[PDB]
């Protein structure tokens, strides 16, 4: 009775397994349905992101073609039907599948699996995604939507500790209206720097104008922390004090539209003309992420004609950088690996209708706690052997993270 | 010989076992006494606070009930003979085990295992603690305090990393009297956040008044760094030039007399009205955290009559949020679980007797490097498997966290 | 030969086999074809409640959404092809299957909730994956085209014969259109409404309905109703005043009461210490025309010298109403059922019900003259079969929610 | 491994285990732990009354002896340190346990009674010795320091999950402090008072209460009454008189009524040949504050002119009044009872009472979203050795009521 792992690895219909792993806490084990049917625009198109490995209750995205081909359109974020922090407070993932077809009744689908976050894609194109990968049981191209692509979650390795997901704490009732706290995200952060050289910041063209430093790609999907220490000195002493504005926007796939917006600003005087600190230290929570973010871009703008002409250098107070780090980031899976799934040439106004389930271990919050067992895990000695050793063959025999949907339905069931 | 490890979980008063899992450092074992005498107050009621797997050396909290019933007031904290800091820089909980009576010659006990954190708990009622948990070898119920409770640490989790204890640096001579920096807990932090709405701000009653925007329950219990940025705009500039105080308190379950509070303040003036922003950017060091703290309390206050009628709007400047991360408070162990022993109906000015025994992997520092040596754990393929699979039958059998004593000494040496 | 009556359990399809437990009565053995072919509304929306363990020959309810998501509109009872209670008096039900797909662009949610119709707190098309966790008491998001079967895994056996509700032989003096009914007795299910010792809120004008209780709670069949609604006023009544006590049952839908029954008092200067207003109404079953799933307990009053009166109502023993149903807790009646929501489905479209019902009946007097009874076949392992199967019901995948395309092949294992 | 029943049974500390029977639902496993630590009056002297087979969360009930031994003063319910009801809709009690000891001189009676709490003909401490012949039901004089353990021994397998009394949801426009509940419905215990055709005691004076009987009966949650007392006075009334019927119901002690109600009606011209006086109530659980033990139905009158004016009893069909409760036929609810009395212990001392009870429950919807049901675990054996344990159950010595020394020891045995 040791299949048991690789069954819920390969079958996750068919419901939760606990991890014979090293992390053995005590847990509960729950599947979790999600359910999503939809919408193709005019233009047949669309990319459908899948985070196979999130720990969250978001574990997908999905973006749409406007008719013109130009560029993405964010729809929604796929969630599961369930919020889970709401009755627990840690979990790790067990194993996933998304099912995506149409649930009409004309359409094709291309799908990989690419090893990086979805910022370090390099092209969404239909076409492009066959070049995310070249592990051929990691990708799946031209398949008629009509026969569906099945997505399957192998495990990015194990070991992996429990993520707190980001729930409400107790509150007392002279608190603001609107006001809460959350034990967030926190654990094996990813962190981005954006690092300025020790030179001069480019001149502005006019006052009140926003003019970039920096623009590239970083993946912010949780809540993060920024810290950081844009120092600049005057060449002279300011005609008049002006006011510097540093602006830090994160945006997503699409439409430059900042999804997060974060500003520090600083007077310049005839006090500290010669060491100027504009001070980042802002905290964005999550709910503040409405969308995947993909870039940054931090700009500056001024406030003064007696400042446009007056070279700031950048080095002065020590190394002009802003870093921002985010929970969990490297937790594998969290932002890596992704699944991509493109469709395109599909009946506008039709449905494509994506099925997920995903079976978790997670710790019950104190409030669940009182009527909820917790237990340590089924004893599996040799599990997780058995699952190392068939991802070991995983080439030879053909176990997918992408499948043809017909194909993954047979040559499935000899897991039983 | 692979009932080693196991030995010394059940057996902690036997001795240490090198943990037998992936996490082979080199290291050295040692087992530390922790001896403690309490007295009883008038009320002979109070609550013991276990922390069974935490790899510091404060192990406990002892809190007492007023002879009111009321409230509850906080003692001292429970810690190891030895302070462990000044001799290793590393260290890894292999196994506790607290042992709790009276030695004097009326009273009972309860006791539960709660899988979360202190703050986490709803009520500390004698009677509550039942309900902290469903699992039956998680709990005691009014077990005499004549014939006592042990409470034994089972594993929550295998393959935990070695944290660093906080030990201090060596110094130059040319120092402050009384500064010293510490090499601290990093690794897996817990992070809460407070998040404020893009909305006003709750107007002072009156000029240098406190006037709360959030309180909640958080757990700290070691070094925590604040980042954040309460930003705000007012409506109208500023009639005379006012200072806005932001005070973040850090509260124990009792008494609301803060264990730690830090402040931020920006002016208001012309200049900068639009877009004000409070920085949040302590480093609370732990030698401030002079009891358990279990809840937050953010509030500002004013400075001037004329901008109490001046509406200061939140969202202006990026989320208005504040953030800290404490070191080590995602490792299980640190903060998560804990074992509440609450005794009541005790005869007054009597004796609580708590005897501790913990089992360390630990890094000796430099100067102990000179002459101790340290060594890869003994091999033992099995060790773990064996653990693993006792605590799988952990319902089976009778293995708990939470023993009436004198079960616990006869049920005991079948583990030798 | 005592894997019998586990292939019934699994493939009703193939016909009865008597239920191997300790209940032996002589009996028959029937099976039941159920056909419905329902319309979509233009919504494309729509529930379907199913009652897999009930021993009636009401098997299910459709419920359709209006064109505005807005709420649900009843359409009908699923019953079965044939009453049941012309021809037997009682029965067990041994076991059921429903097959649910498009005779003719659509999907299905499916879950089997382990409590009442009433209990249930949503039922939006994704609200149903939240009404039970057991990973085979749910399938989301099944192609209509391919279907979604519902199979009926025993609740608990050693049931009892429930009686079914046979009318009685009449006399012929008898009112036209009155008839008497032996129903639904055993093991009922009973509400109470408790109404606190304090006084009645005051109505907001004379005629006017004002509410005293609203809440969840089901019937489904004949009913019984005890109670004394009773109370004080605190100065006699200026005029006599008249006390009206409504109790509404409703459903899922529209407010529009199923069934409601008042009972009144007169309020004079001889009882106004203590008057009671008495219920005693026994509501039959043709009366529930469909599912109830909520009661409303309203009184209001008659005159104006009686608005400005404080009532209180502790007065002559506890204020409260209590109705009691028969068969109302005997497993499979009201608990458990099984939810499944269509959703984007062609209007005017039809979506094809087949159900299959297998009973253990006892034949009525007049089939008596003809018809055997028997003692059911001896099986010994027969039961300890399917607990055993039930038993490791997650290790293997049996459901009572399949993919109609999986139930089909997975199935001819039990032959 | 098959003994898992068994112990269950035998060491409840152990925790639940699924009970191996007909009545296989899908359902949770859950342990209770009650804590009581109760004081003793000046006269040291107590009655500790268990109901070893309740489903109920109510396990028990403590009465102490006033200083002069006259009589006994109710002093709690013994309950569970969680009320079940608001986290399970159904359950059924696998197994329980009472350990009674000082946890600080006096000695401890007990006897298990096999039949309710008002059936007991007496409670002085040495009475309890002859509730009961069987050996292995009753334990005498037993130090209150060693202390006396109560076990329950299955009273009847395939017993039925009984509905707790959950709450239901309501609607917001209710009034303040009303709420309808899901209560005990199933197989309940029904008195009847049979008052004969014959004419009414006569009142002593006006408005004074006449007793017309009074007797024995055990009433424990949710009773509906029903009845008709009916009759008709000799000569028209020469003033209309107002008739009143009170049903007291009283516990052991004090004669002060836990629960009272009330019907009255009016004798006019227009009725005096039948007048009737209708019982209708509906007692909710709340209601009884204390165990009721025995009934009184008494009435009185209105008027002089009334003394005097014969009422027979019998004029429009049978005086009589019923009350049915739930559950109260299952057994284990009412039936049986263990009695613990302790007597000669130091005043102001504490007798501590550790319970434990283990569950089969059915989660509410809510606890249903997350929390996994699952058939019993396959146990073909189990009920077998557990019926042949309780056959020799003489021969060897299971006990309900064991010395607590001796229940440690020989116990182990059973792992
Ligand atoms: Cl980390
Ligand atoms: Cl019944
Ligand atoms: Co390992
Ligand atoms: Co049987």
């Given at each position: 009775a040791t299949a048991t792992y690789l069954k819920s690895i390969m079958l996750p219909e068919t419901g939760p397994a606990s991890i014979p792993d090293d992390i053995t806490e005590r847990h509960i084990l729950k599947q979790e349905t999600s359910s999503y049917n939809l919408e193709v625009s005019e233009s047949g198109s669309g990319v459908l992101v899948c985070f196979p490995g999130a720990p969250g209750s978001r574990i997908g995205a999905h973006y749409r073609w406007n008719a013109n081909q130009t560029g993405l359109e964010f729809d929604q974020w796929l969630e599961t039907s369930q919020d889970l922090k709401k009755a627990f407070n840690y979990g790790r993932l067990i194993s996933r599948?998304?099912?995506?077809?149409?649930?009409?009744?004309?359409?094709?689908?291309?799908?990989?699996?690419?090893?990086?976050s979805l910022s370090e894609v390099e092209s969404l194109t239909y076409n492009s995604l066959m070049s995310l990968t070249t592990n051929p049981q990691d990708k799946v191209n031209n398949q008629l939507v009509t026969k569906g692509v099945t997505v399957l979650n192998l495990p990015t390795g194990f070991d992996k500790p429990y993520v707190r997901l980001e729930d409400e704490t107790p509150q007392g009732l002279q608190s603001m209206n609107g006001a809460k706290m959350r034990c967030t995200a926190a654990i094996?952060?990813?962190?981005?720097?954006?690092?300025?050289?020790?030179?001069?910041?480019?001149?502005?063209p006019a006052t009140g104008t926003l003019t970039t430093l920096y623009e590239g790609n970083a993946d912010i999907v949780n809540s993060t922390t920024v810290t950081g220490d844009i120092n600049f000195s005057l060449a002279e002493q300011p005609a008049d004090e002006t006011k510097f504005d540093f602006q830090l926007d994160f945006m997503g796939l699409d439409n430059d539209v900042p999804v997060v917006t974060v500003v520090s600003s600083v007077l310049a005087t005839n006090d500290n003309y010669r060491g100027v600190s504009a001070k980042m230290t802002q905290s964005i929570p999550t709910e503040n992420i409405t969308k995947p973010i993909t870039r940054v871009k931090l700009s500056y703008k001024i406030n003064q004609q007696t400042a446009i002409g007056n070279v700031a250098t950048l080095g002065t107070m020590g190394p002009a950088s802003v870093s921002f780090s985010s929970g969990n980031?490297?937790?594998?899976?969290?932002?890596?690996?992704?699944?991509?799934?493109?469709?395109?040439?599909?009946?506008?106004?039709?449905?494509?209708?994506?099925?997920?389930?995903?079976?978790?271990?997670?710790?019950?919050?104190?409030?669940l706690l009182k009527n909820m067992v917790t237990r340590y895990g089924k004893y599996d000695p040799e599990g997780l052997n058995y699952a190392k050793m068939i991802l070991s063959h995983r080439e030879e025999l053909d176990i997918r993270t992408v499948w043809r949907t017909e194909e993954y339905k047979e040559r499935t069931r000899v897991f039983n």
């Open positions: 599948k998304y099912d995506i077809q149409s649930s009409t009744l004309n359409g094709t689908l291309n799908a990989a699996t690419f090893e990086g094996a952060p990813r962190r981005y720097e954006i690092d300025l050289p020790s030179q001069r910041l480019p001149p502005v980031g490297n937790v594998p899976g969290v932002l890596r690996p992704i699944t991509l799934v493109a469709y395109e040439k599909m009946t506008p106004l039709s449905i494509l209708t994506v099925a997920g389930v995903s079976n978790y271990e997670l710790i019950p919050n104190p409030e």
